[PDB]
Design a protein around this ligand. Sequence first.
Ligand code: CAC
Ligand code: CAC
Ligand code: CAC
Ligand code: ZN
Ligand code: ZN
Ligand code: ZN
Ligand code: ZN
Ligand code: ZN
Ligand code: ZN
Ligand code: ZN
Ligand code: ZN
Ligand code: ZN
Ligand code: ZN
Ligand code: ZN
Ligand code: ZN
Ligand code: ZN
Length: 160
Amino acid sequence: DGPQKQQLEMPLVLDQDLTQQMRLRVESLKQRGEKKQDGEKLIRPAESVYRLDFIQQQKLQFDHWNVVLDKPGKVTITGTSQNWTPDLTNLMTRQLLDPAAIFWRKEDSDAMDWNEADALEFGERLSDLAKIRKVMYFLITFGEGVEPANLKASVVFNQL
Ligand SMILES: C[As](C)(=O)[O-]
Ligand SMILES: C[As](C)(=O)[O-]
Ligand SMILES: C[As](C)(=O)[O-]
Ligand SMILES: [Zn+2]
Ligand SMILES: [Zn+2]
Ligand SMILES: [Zn+2]
Ligand SMILES: [Zn+2]
Ligand SMILES: [Zn+2]
Ligand SMILES: [Zn+2]
Ligand SMILES: [Zn+2]
Ligand SMILES: [Zn+2]
Ligand SMILES: [Zn+2]
Ligand SMILES: [Zn+2]
Ligand SMILES: [Zn+2]
Ligand SMILES: [Zn+2]
Ligand SMILES: [Zn+2]
């Protein structure tokens, strides 16, 4: 908009503990032979839980994503209802957001690509979801050839 605005880049960091929580849960149901909680969303092996901590709940405007990969691959960052307390609820399929920001990189080059229109729609939303709580949770789906160790995934906001 304007080349003048202060920007704050906030990293989506790997949430190893809850990722595992979720990983053990899908087990459990296996060893127990119990079914899920009706509309419960079970973390697949290909997904990993990421965390985003909002440094300034207010005055965040969202500006652009800053996601890049090490190898050619694909990733999908599906947001999560800010009403989901991983301390309390079990993530419900319905708690996932629409849409998701899908990013990918093709073989020969280094240039990142994504689903623009959607990555922007989902984006403009973080500026408000920030005012709900200082913690945002996401579920990243890794393609083939990609694993957590190839990704940088911060979100750049504008300071109002
Ligand atoms: C300067 As802008 C269009 O990335 O909010
Ligand atoms: C889901 As937790 C163990 O980071 O409060
Ligand atoms: C071809 As696929 C949708 O199983 O990564
Ligand atoms: Zn944690
Ligand atoms: Zn679960
Ligand atoms: Zn902007
Ligand atoms: Zn592909
Ligand atoms: Zn917790
Ligand atoms: Zn849609
Ligand atoms: Zn494109
Ligand atoms: Zn779409
Ligand atoms: Zn818009
Ligand atoms: Zn819109
Ligand atoms: Zn896959
Ligand atoms: Zn695939
Ligand atoms: Zn393929």
